[PDB]
Amino acid sequence: MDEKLLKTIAESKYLVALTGAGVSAESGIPTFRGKDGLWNRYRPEELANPQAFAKDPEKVWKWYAWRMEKVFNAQPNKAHQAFAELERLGVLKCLITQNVDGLHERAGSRNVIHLHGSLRVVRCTSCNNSFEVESAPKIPPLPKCDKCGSLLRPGVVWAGEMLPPDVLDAAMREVERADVIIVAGTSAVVQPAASLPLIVKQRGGAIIEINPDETPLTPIADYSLRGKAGEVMDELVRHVRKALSLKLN
């Protein structure tokens, strides 16, 4: 919490944010690399594989239905709320997220780019069908397609796969027009997201990183808040609404 930090956020011309699983952790959703991620002694990187779904669809789907039921009952925590607020007040123009939970929209956020897909999405492993669901499917019985009849999968992006074309470009646009970016709850490793903030930094724009841990992005972000996105973001937006009251209006 600094005057310059605030002045920066306050005077943004096109401020954007990039969120990761860390931002939802206080909502009870396990991160991807934290100890809270171990599911049956499995690391997330061992199930979100395109091969793992092939080696054994049963196990992977159990993991997803399990995650789904959790995200579908979870409540958007303070951090989510703060970003939703920062967009209402007009400061934040766009929110880029790697999370697949709809915890941001549940806070109210309008302009949201889902780089890695959504859990509400279930597309086909055979045809071109895809739909949104409301509940987690009791997994014991493997999900089949209501059309061409075949195997269904989580409408999310796995490693080695490729994120929706249009989506990355829309993001490439936001950060290519942004002057300031808030990077919260992400480990600064998985690409091509990690590279997004570096873009702003290249064009001169400013970076604000919110993370309890030091990350390979820290060493270059203009400012670096050491805490949980819940507190930081909330206490932050609180001072932003105050700073927002100055000049012409």
Interface residues with its own copies (CB under 8 A) are 73, 75, 78, 81, 88, 108, 241-242, 245, 249
| Binding partner of 100, given its own copies, Zn ion, ligand OAD, none, CB within 5-8 angstroms per partner class | ligand OAD
Instruction: Give me the residue label for tokens 């306050």.
Output: 10
- Establish whether 96 is an annotated binding residue: no
DSSP 107: G
- Establish whether 21 is an annotated binding residue: yes
Spatial separation of the C-alpha atoms in residues 23 and 229, rounded to whole Å: 6
In angstroms, what is the minimal distance from the CB of 193 to ligand OAD?
7
In angstroms, what is the minimal distance from the CB of 12 to its own copies?
18
Alpha helices in the chain (DSSP H): 3-10, 52-55, 57-71, 78-88, 165-177, 195-202, 229-243
Q: Which residue is nearest to ligand OAD (CB)?
A: 22
- Establish whether 30 is an annotated binding residue: yes
The catalytic residue among 80, 104, 116, 239 is 116
* Strand ranges of the sheet holding 206-210, from the earlier edge strand across to the other edge: 112-114, 92-97, 15-19, 180-184, 206-210, 223-225
Contacts of 11 (CB under 8 A, 6+ apart): none
Structure tokens at 74: 């979870």
- Establish whether 101 is an annotated binding residue: yes
In angstroms, what is the minimal distance from the CB of 141 to Zn ion?
16
- Establish whether 124 is an annotated binding residue: yes
Of 3 and 195, which has the nearer Cβ to ligand OAD? 195
In angstroms, what is the minimal distance from the CB of 76 to its own copies?
9
**Phi and psi, residue 187, nearest 5°:** -80, -10
Q: Residue 128: what residue type?
A: N
* Strand ranges of the sheet holding 117-124, from the earlier edge strand across to the other edge: 130-132, 117-124, 152-156
- Establish whether 149 is an annotated binding residue: no
Of 74 and 199, which has the nearer Cβ to its own copies? 74
In angstroms, what is the minimal distance from the CB of 37 to its own copies?
23
Chain positions contacting ligand OAD, by CB under 6 A: 20-23, 25-26, 31-34, 48, 98, 100, 116, 156-158, 184-187, 190, 210-213, 215, 228-230
For every residue of 125-191, which 3-state class applies, written as one string?
CCCCCEEECCCCCCCCCCCECCCCCCEEEEEECCCCCCCCHHHHHHHHHHHHHCCEEEEECCCCCCC
Of 88 and 123, which has the nearer Cβ to its own copies? 88
| Binding partner of 201, given ligand OAD, Zn ion, its own copies, none, CB within 5-8 angstroms per partner class | none
239 is catalytic: no
Of 68 and 217, which has the nearer Cβ to its own copies? 68
Q: Residue 218: what residue type?
A: T
Residues marked as catalytic? 116
Indicate the annotated binding residues for Zn(2+). Answer: 124, 127, 145, 148
Indicate the annotated binding residues for substrate. Answer: 64, 67
